[PDB]
Design goal:
The PDB classes it as protein binding. By secondary structure, the chain is mainly β. It has no helices and twelve strands.
């Protein structure tokens, strides 16, 4: 069982930055991937950044070059550095790992990101 603790979001001006933190606990040793998802108002939740245990990363086109996902193994935390924020980035952000059809963990409350202009 893996629990995920999301933090770092909030209200920020366009062009500003936020750093999201996804802290994992439980059977964390075997986590293959970890993704940052976002869910804009009224929209499906989509994966926008993902990192492998090896540190490999992948990004949704919309956030490429602006968001950076990284992990600190010692702290069992996966970060999303969000730079050059746009109003279009407003969403609740969640971290999770997909395991087949289902997810590694119950979805957390996520962390609201609101980008004002």
């Amino acid at each position: 069982q893996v629990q995920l603790q999301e933090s770092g979001g909030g209200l920020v001006q366009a062009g500003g930055s936020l750093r999201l933190s996804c802290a994992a606990s439980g059977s964390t040793f075997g986590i293959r991937t970890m993704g940052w998802y976002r869910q804009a108002p009224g929209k499906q939740r989509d994966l926008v950044a993902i990192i492998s245990s090896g540190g490999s990363t992948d990004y949704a086109d919309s956030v490429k070059g602006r968001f950076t996902i990284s992990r600190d193994n010692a702290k069992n935390t996966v970060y999303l550095q969000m730079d050059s924020l746009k109003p279009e980035d407003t969403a609740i952000y969640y971290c999770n790992a997909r395991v087949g059809i289902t997810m590694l963990a119950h979805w957390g409350q996520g962390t609201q990101v609101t980008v004002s202009s």
